[PDB]
């Protein structure tokens, strides 16, 4: 018995990460095992850690958490350093529009746990962590109970299936800092401190949790691992385009008929995601713009772009927020400004003041209380958040809003008057 969760719509063309998770209920271990679950783990424990790293690398699996860092290579970097090591599953979501990870956690917890075990074994980590946001209580309790399930079936604990490999997975909880998603800050929180990111280098894979080599990987990343082992890296690299291969979760929200998470290959176009899969716009109103989480803004003229990590591709976490002709682009940018206002941790001066003042002055712009100096000031602040920042938040706080000033100036000019 778990708390109430809204039943997000889930739909897949690949029937991999959402094969169970498409159905909006907890799937417990006997169901998981019945679909041949934990058999990838059995197979993996009969390969050498190094050969798992190779397969994951040859797979072309990339970070699903927004970095797009090649996962196999991240592991290589971890294991170059002396043991002991730690594997962390980033269960923190926070970024707006992004709700892909929660449907793995809440519906198919065992896919994630299998992923964590294989990945841990690969880097020789005998201790792993899930750091799950505090606004995901169901996910917390479901993970705790599903880990207990795995313990009793002998997939966790010491000398797992006579392999000789020891693993405990511990479940920690956030308490409402977004920045706790940035991998050094997440570790600071796990150590029982304020979610303040670290200057890099050192990088986690060199110095991380208690200064020991640390792999942090996104929920969706780790969910792909069992498939790579089970199917083979060859058969996995076959799914969607060879250069950005494998299944991807697209959380689609805003003014579409069928909002939810969609499991597609990454050669899907942004138009296909909205109009073919998400059932098009509400009232069939013309698409105005697409917000890639709190990261980018694409216009109605950029819908023909692939949903892959390539330069001219959609990229990010595959978060699709759809706005129609009747949506205020300015009011929208204000709500992105206000997100970064709340979630700058205030270590870095241009980021601390930049994120807050951007939002403070834009709020004035939106309400028609802005002096001409507040306008000139808003513009300057937006282009001066990046300087001195020791993590990606400062780098991106002004990014999306800048793009909207560039692509929809007519609508911003309405507010100058």
């Amino acid at each position: 018995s778990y708390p109430a969760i809204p039943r997000i719509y889930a739909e897949t063309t690949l029937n991999m990460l959402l094969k169970r998770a498409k159905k909006p209920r907890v799937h417990s271990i006997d169901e998981y095992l019945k679909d041949g679950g934990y058999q990838a783990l059995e197979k993996a424990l009969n390969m050498s850690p190094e050969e798992i790293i190779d397969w994951v690398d040859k797979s072309t699996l990339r970070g699903r958490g927004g970095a797009g860092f090649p996962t196999g290579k991240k592991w290589k970097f971890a294991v170059q350093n002396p043991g002991p090591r730690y594997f962390i599953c980033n269960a923190d979501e926070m970024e707006p529009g992004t709700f892909k990870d929660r449907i793995i956690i809440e519906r198919d917890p065992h896919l994630l746990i299998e992923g964590i075990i294989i990945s841990s074994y690969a880097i020789g980590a005998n201790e792993a962590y899930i750091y799950i946001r505090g606004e995901y209580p169901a996910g917390y309790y479901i993970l705790r109970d599903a880990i207990e399930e795995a313990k009793k079936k002998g997939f966790l604990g010491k000398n797992i299936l006579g392999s000789g490999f020891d693993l405990e997975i511990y479940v920690a909880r956030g308490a409402g800092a977004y920045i706790c998603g940035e991998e050094t800050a997440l570790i600071e929180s796990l150590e029982g401190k304020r979610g303040h990111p670290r200057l890099k280098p050192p990088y986690p894979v060199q110095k991380g949790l208690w200064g020991k080599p640390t792999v942090v990987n996104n929920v969706e990343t780790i969910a792909n691992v069992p498939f790579i082992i089970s199917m083979g890296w060859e058969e996995y690299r076959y799914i969607g385009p060879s250069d950005y291969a494998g299944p991807k979760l697209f959380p689609v929200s805003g003014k579409v008929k069928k909002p939810g998470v969609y499991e597609l290959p990454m050669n899907t176009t942004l138009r296909e995601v909205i109009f073919k899969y998400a059932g098009g716009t509400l009232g069939n109103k013309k698409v105005k713009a697409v917000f890639s989480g709190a990261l980018d803004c694409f216009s109605s003229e950029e819908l023909d772009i692939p949903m892959d990590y390539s330069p001219l591709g959609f990229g990010g976490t595959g978060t699709v927020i759809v706005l129609t002709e009747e949506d205020d682009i300015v009011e929208a940018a204000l709500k992105i400004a206000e997100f970064y206002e709340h979630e700058t941790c205030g270590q870095c001066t241009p980021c601390r003041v930049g994120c807050y003042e951007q939002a403070n002055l834009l709020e004035k712009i939106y309400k028609g209380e802005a002096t001409e100096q507040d306008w000139e000031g808003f513009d300057f602040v937006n282009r001066n958040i990046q300087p001195t920042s020791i993590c990606g938040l400062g780098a991106v706080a002004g990014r999306l809003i800048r793009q909207t000033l560039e692509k929809f100036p007519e609508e911003w000019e309405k507010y100058r008057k």
Partner: protein, 157 residues
């Protein structure tokens, strides 16, 4: 006398502390549990917890202050976390707040006269497709209408 935890609380706290390899890693689960019990973080409760964690008090305080979820200001049985971020705002956060005002008679940041409900403006709750979203403590819901919301809140006694 020295403030002390009820044993049905101190048991849980002690469990959380023994859960991780190092005691200090439990601080967030302890605070979640303390706020769950008391309806807020009593200032009085941090001194005992610091002892329990083998951490300095000023460290513990500094942590409570940093994290948005913890409130040492206001008591409330039930925290209505209302999402105010981009998607929820586009899909009718305002109609939800309006309904909450109509039913409970309080705006965001405020507590009902019986200290039953506090409305908490939060960033994106990670259910944007079910917007506009709100939680009532651990329970998370889509807002559809005032009549629908009135029914949900009747379930909290």
């Amino acid at each position: 006398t020295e403030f002390e935890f009820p044993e049905e609380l101190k048991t849980k706290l002690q469990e959380h502390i023994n859960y991780f390899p190092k005691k200090r890693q439990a601080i967030l689960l302890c605070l979640h549990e303390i706020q769950n019990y008391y309806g807020y973080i009593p200032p009085e409760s941090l001194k005992p917890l610091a002892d329990m964690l083998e951490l300095p008090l000023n460290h513990v305080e500094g942590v409570v202050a940093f994290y948005d979820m913890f409130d040492r200001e206001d008591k409330a049985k039930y925290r209505i976390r209302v999402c105010v971020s981009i998607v929820c705002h586009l899909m009718g956060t305002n109609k939800l707040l309006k309904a909450l005002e109509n039913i409970l008679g309080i705006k965001p940041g405020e507590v009902t006269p019986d200290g039953k409900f506090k409305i908490v403006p939060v960033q994106c709750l990670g259910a944007c497709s079910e917007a506009p979203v709100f939680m009532v403590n651990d329970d998370e819901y889509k807002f559809e209408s005032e009549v629908q919301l009135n029914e949900i809140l009747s379930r909290y006694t």
